[PDB]
Swiss-Prot record, chain B:
Gene: gyrB
Further details from the record: Few gyrases are as efficient as E.coli at forming negative supercoils. Not all organisms have 2 type II topoisomerases; in organisms with a single type II topoisomerase this enzyme also has to decatenate newly replicated chromosomes.
Protein location: Cytoplasm
Family: Belongs to the type II topoisomerase GyrB family.
Whole-protein residues included: 22 to 254 of 675
Function, in words: Supercoils relaxed DNA in an ATP-dependent manner. A type II topoisomerase that negatively supercoils closed circular double-stranded (ds) DNA in an ATP-dependent manner to modulate DNA topology and maintain chromosomes in an underwound state, also catalyzes the interconversion of other topological isomers of double-stranded DNA rings, including catenanes. At comparable concentrations has a stronger decatenation activity than E.coli, which is inhibited by ciprofloxacin and novobiocin. Cleaves dsDNA at the sequence 5'-AT/GGCC-3', leaving a 4 base overhang. Negative supercoiling favors strand separation, and DNA replication, transcription, recombination and repair, all of which involve strand separation. Type II topoisomerases break and join 2 DNA strands simultaneously in an ATP-dependent manner.
Domain of life: Bacteria
Subunit structure: Heterotetramer, composed of two GyrA and two GyrB chains. In the heterotetramer, GyrA contains the active site tyrosine that forms a transient covalent intermediate with DNA, while GyrB binds cofactors and catalyzes ATP hydrolysis.
This protein's name: DNA gyrase subunit B
Amino acid sequence: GLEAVRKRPGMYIGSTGERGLHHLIWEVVDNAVDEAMAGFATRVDVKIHADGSVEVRDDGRGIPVEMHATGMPTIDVVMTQLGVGVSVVNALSTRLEATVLRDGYEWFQYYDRSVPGKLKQGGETKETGTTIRFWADPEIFETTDYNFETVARRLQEMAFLNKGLTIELTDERDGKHRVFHYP
Amino acid sequence: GLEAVRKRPGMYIGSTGERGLHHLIWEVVDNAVDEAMAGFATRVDVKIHADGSVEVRDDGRGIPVEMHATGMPTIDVVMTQLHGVGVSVVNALSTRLEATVLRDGYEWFQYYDRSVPGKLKQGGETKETGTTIRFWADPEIFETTDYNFETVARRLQEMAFLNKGLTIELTDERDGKHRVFHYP
Ligand SMILES: CO[C@H]1CN(c2nc(-c3ncnn3C)c(C(=O)O)s2)CC[C@H]1NC(=O)c1[nH]c(C)c(Cl)c1Br
Ligand SMILES: CO[C@H]1CN(c2nc(-c3ncnn3C)c(C(=O)O)s2)CC[C@H]1NC(=O)c1[nH]c(C)c(Cl)c1Br
Ligand SMILES: [Ca+2]
C-alpha cells in the first residue's frame, strides 16, 4: 500500500530535505491548478499555519464524496490508493484533513497517518471546492519549516503559467501576504 | 503588441535574471504537460543546445497550422497575440524561435525573427504528431542566458512526479549530460 511511499519517499517525491518538503505543496496546488485548467476553479488559497500545517483551498467542483466501485468513498480512493498524487502527501503526513463542498452540503474527511476516519456530512452550502490541510511528517522530513520566499516564487510562476487564475498566499507565522493574478 | 512584453518583461515572467530566464523553459514545457493532461502527449524531450537555444518536443496533437478565423495561421496567432498558452511571451523575449509541427499528414515549419513570422513551409509527409519549439532567449533582455543543468533537471523531475506516467527527457549538449524522468 502507502507503506511503499513511506519506505522509499525519494521514488515518489525526490528527496526528504527542503525540496521534498516543498514538493508536498506543489502536489496539492497542482491538483487545484488542474481543476482550473479543466475550467472549474478560478482561485487557489494557500495558508502556511503556525502549527506546521499547510492548507490549500480551491473553488473547483470538489473531490467526489460518493462511494466508489472499490467499496469506499471516492475521496478515500484518491487519498489512499497509489495526474492526482495527493495519496503521496497523505502517506508522508501525520495528519491530513479534507473539507469538500459539493452536492448541496459541506463534507469532512480526516486521516490519521493516512488512515481514514468517518466521512462527516454537515451544513448545507450552495458553494463548491476542495480544502486540504496536511501536517508533514517530522520523522520522514529533514526539516518541516516551510520557506515563505520559496512558496511565493513558485506560486507566482504558477500564476504566470495559468494567466487569469488567482493564487493567494498567507503565512500565518510572521501575517505575510501575497496575491498573484495576471492578465 | 508584443512590444509591451519587451518593455516590461517582469509583468509577464517575474524577473530578467536566472529565474526569469528559466521561466521560458517552464512556459514551453507547461504547454506540453497540458497536452499530456489533455490525454494526447505521453513524452516531453528537452534539449539545451550549445548555441544558447532550448528545444522542447512533445508527441501531442501538434499546434493547429490551418488558417485561423482572424487572418494569419493558428500557430502565428499562438506565437504573436497576447487558453493557459503563453508561448507568445517566449517569442517576444527571444531573438529567434522555430516551430516544427507534425499534423494533417505532413511536417510543418514556422520560424520567427524577433517575433516576426516567416512563411509557413509545408514539407515531408508524416503519420506522426507533435510540437517542437526551439527558442533563443534575448541577451539584451536577460541578465544571463546560461541555463543551469541542475535547475532544469530538478524542475523536470518534479513535473514527472506531478504527472506520474509522463516521460520527460533532458539532454544538455554543452557537457552530453542526460536524464530520463518517468515514474509509476
Ligand atoms: C479527483 O478530483 C478532481 C476531479 N473532481 C471531479 N471529478 C469528477 C468526475 N469526473 C468523472 N467522474 N467523476 C466522478 C467529478 C464529478 O463528476 O462531479 S468532480 C473535482 C475535484 C478534483 N480535485 C481537486 O480539485 C483537488 N483540489 C485539491 C486542492 C486537491 Cl489535492 C485535489 Br485532488
Ligand atoms: C495551442 O495548441 C494546443 C492545443 N492543440 C490543439 N487544439 C485543438 C483544438 N481543440 C479545439 N479547437 N482546436 C483548434 C486541436 C485540434 O482539435 O485540431 S489541436 C494541440 C497542441 C497544443 N499545444 C501544444 O501541444 C504545445 N506544445 C508546446 C511544446 C507548446 Cl509551446 C505548445 Br502551445
Ligand atoms: Ca541545428
